[PDB]
Write an enzyme that holds these catalytic residues in place. Structure first.
Site, PDB file in Angstrom:
ATOM      1  N   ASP A 130       0.809  -1.420   0.159  1.00 49.82           N
ATOM      2  CA  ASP A 130      -0.029   0.493   0.106  1.00 49.82           C
ATOM      3  C   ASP A 130       0.758   1.272  -0.159  1.00 49.82           C
ATOM      4  O   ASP A 130      -0.337   2.484   0.190  1.00 49.82           O
ATOM      5  CB  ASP A 130      -0.737  -0.123   0.871  1.00 49.82           C
ATOM      6  CG  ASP A 130       0.009   0.069   2.512  1.00 49.82           C
ATOM      7  OD1 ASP A 130       0.750  -0.372   3.006  1.00 49.82           O
ATOM      8  OD2 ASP A 130      -1.093   0.098   3.468  1.00 49.82           O
ATOM      9  N   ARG A 182       0.457   6.906  -0.239  1.00 39.13           N
ATOM     10  CA  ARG A 182      -0.254   6.246   0.884  1.00 39.13           C
ATOM     11  C   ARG A 182      -1.801   5.477  -0.912  1.00 39.13           C
ATOM     12  O   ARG A 182      -1.853   6.140  -0.228  1.00 39.13           O
ATOM     13  CB  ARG A 182      -0.959   6.294   2.252  1.00 39.13           C
ATOM     14  CG  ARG A 182      -1.760   5.544   2.886  1.00 39.13           C
ATOM     15  CD  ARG A 182      -1.078   3.822   3.032  1.00 39.13           C
ATOM     16  NE  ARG A 182      -1.584   3.192   3.813  1.00 39.13           N
ATOM     17  CZ  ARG A 182      -3.502   2.916   3.587  1.00 39.13           C
ATOM     18  NH1 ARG A 182      -3.023   1.966   2.191  1.00 39.13           N
ATOM     19  NH2 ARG A 182      -3.636   1.162   3.616  1.00 39.13           N
ATOM     20  N   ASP A 218      -6.577  -1.372   2.286  1.00 37.45           N
ATOM     21  CA  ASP A 218      -5.724  -2.074   3.159  1.00 37.45           C
ATOM     22  C   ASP A 218      -5.505  -3.154   2.437  1.00 37.45           C
ATOM     23  O   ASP A 218      -6.043  -4.424   2.585  1.00 37.45           O
ATOM     24  CB  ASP A 218      -6.841  -1.869   4.699  1.00 37.45           C
ATOM     25  CG  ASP A 218      -7.235  -1.245   5.034  1.00 37.45           C
ATOM     26  OD1 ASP A 218      -6.286   0.191   4.915  1.00 37.45           O
ATOM     27  OD2 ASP A 218      -8.473  -1.285   6.103  1.00 37.45           O
ATOM     28  N   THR A 219      -3.636  -2.938   3.056  1.00 35.94           N
ATOM     29  CA  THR A 219      -3.076  -4.814   2.012  1.00 35.94           C
ATOM     30  C   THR A 219      -2.505  -5.394   3.609  1.00 35.94           C
ATOM     31  O   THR A 219      -2.024  -4.324   4.043  1.00 35.94           O
ATOM     32  CB  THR A 219      -2.022  -4.076   1.168  1.00 35.94           C
ATOM     33  OG1 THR A 219      -0.947  -3.439   1.651  1.00 35.94           O
ATOM     34  CG2 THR A 219      -2.672  -3.207   0.037  1.00 35.94           C
ATOM     35  N   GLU A 240       0.496  -5.917   5.593  1.00 38.45           N
ATOM     36  CA  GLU A 240       1.281  -6.030   6.022  1.00 38.45           C
ATOM     37  C   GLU A 240       3.114  -6.747   6.517  1.00 38.45           C
ATOM     38  O   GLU A 240       2.640  -7.640   6.809  1.00 38.45           O
ATOM     39  CB  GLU A 240       1.834  -4.739   7.385  1.00 38.45           C
ATOM     40  CG  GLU A 240       1.995  -3.307   7.272  1.00 38.45           C
ATOM     41  CD  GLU A 240       0.838  -2.856   7.797  1.00 38.45           C
ATOM     42  OE1 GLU A 240      -0.200  -2.804   8.334  1.00 38.45           O
ATOM     43  OE2 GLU A 240       0.767  -1.249   6.999  1.00 38.45           O
ATOM     44  N   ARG A 247       2.387  11.482   4.294  1.00 40.96           N
ATOM     45  CA  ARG A 247       2.314  10.636   3.189  1.00 40.96           C
ATOM     46  C   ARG A 247       1.345  11.052   1.759  1.00 40.96           C
ATOM     47  O   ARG A 247      -0.021  11.658   2.348  1.00 40.96           O
ATOM     48  CB  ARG A 247       1.968   9.336   3.126  1.00 40.96           C
ATOM     49  CG  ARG A 247       3.442   8.519   4.104  1.00 40.96           C
ATOM     50  CD  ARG A 247       2.979   7.302   4.836  1.00 40.96           C
ATOM     51  NE  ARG A 247       1.076   6.834   5.836  1.00 40.96           N
ATOM     52  CZ  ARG A 247       1.242   6.133   5.610  1.00 40.96           C
ATOM     53  NH1 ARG A 247       1.521   4.855   5.073  1.00 40.96           N
ATOM     54  NH2 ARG A 247       0.199   5.517   6.619  1.00 40.96           N
TER      55      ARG A 247
END
Length: 136
Positions: free
Chosen positions: A16, A30, A35-36, A38, A82
């Site tokens: 992400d 970002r 939402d990937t 982590e 970000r």
């Protein structure tokens, strides 16, 4: 009306997060609305599908001839500094490709930045329906 601006890949960091040269300066971006899993989870180590979601983003941006960034209508940076945007690789949105492949879940956590929320929701349903990766 949103508009795409050019950027140059510096390096892919996570599923992400990508570092790009934007308007002549290096910035960490970002990916909006996803939402990937982590690989650099502050707490939880390497989450299942993390390596896969990372490889996926990396492959897509590293093999593109043109990368573009599209800010949404709300705030453009998060509290960590970000940039919050949708990223495109040869005209394909990375944000959507991840969700479609079941490598990310639709987040939605900046109420103003929602321009593509529905579009993403439809791809996530399809990934769910096909029981891919995360949905498997």
């Amino acid at each position: 009306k949103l508009h795409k601006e050019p950027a140059t890949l510096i390096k892919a960091i996570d599923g992400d997060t990508v570092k790009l040269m934007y308007k002549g300066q290096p910035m960490t971006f970002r990916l909006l609305l996803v939402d990937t899993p982590e690989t650099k989870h502050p707490k939880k180590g390497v989450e299942k599908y993390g390596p896969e979601a990372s490889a996926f983003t990396k492959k897509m941006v590293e093999n593109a001839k043109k990368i573009e960034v599209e800010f949404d209508k709300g705030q453009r940076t998060d509290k960590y500094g970000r940039g919050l945007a949708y990223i495109y690789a040869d005209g394909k949105m990375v944000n959507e490709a991840l969700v479609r492949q079941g490598l990310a879940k639709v987040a939605y956590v900046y109420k103003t930045n929602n321009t593509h929320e529905q579009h993403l929701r439809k791809s996530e349903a399809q990934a769910k329906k096909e029981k891919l990766n995360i949905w498997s």
